[PDB]
């Protein structure tokens, strides 16, 4: 799987697209996962959730009309979600987050 900062960072920027083990938190829900159980690797083994829009309700990242925000997480293998996420921009900027979305820096 493809699910490194650099990783992914990279991939997006030449295919524009999510590797192929992700999947977007309803399509999860769909599938049996329960969030409060921590089973994602459980119900789809190999995946880690990914392509959901970020809302950036706080303007943390920079705007830009047309622009459109998206997470990944990073790092994820199994159990509870982690707090590693790659932000892309839908004209392939990225940043990444250690630390649930209060602080980001750039990577691409
Ligand atoms: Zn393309």
Same mark, same amino acid.
């Given at each position: 799987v493809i699910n490194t900062f650099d990783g992914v960072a990279d991939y997006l920027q030449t295919y524009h697209? !999510?590797? /192929?083990? *992700?999947?977007?938190? &309803? @399509? =999860?829900? =769909? !599938?049996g996962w329960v969030a409060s159980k921590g089973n994602l690797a459980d119900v789809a083994p190999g995946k880690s959730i990914g392509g959901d829009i970020? &809302?950036?309700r706080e303007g943390k990242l920079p705007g830009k &009309?047309? +622009?459109?925000? +998206? @997470?990944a997480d990073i790092n994820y293998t199994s159990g509870f979600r982690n707090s /590693? +996420?790659? !932000? *892309?921009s839908s004209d392939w900027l990225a940043y990444?987050?250690? /630390?649930h979305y209060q602080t980001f820096t750039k990577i691409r």
């Open positions: 697209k !999510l590797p /192929d083990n *992700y999947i977007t938190k &309803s @399509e =999860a829900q =769909a !599938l970020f &809302s950036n &009309s047309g +622009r459109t925000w +998206r @997470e /590693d +996420r790659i !932000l *892309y990444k987050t250690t /630390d």
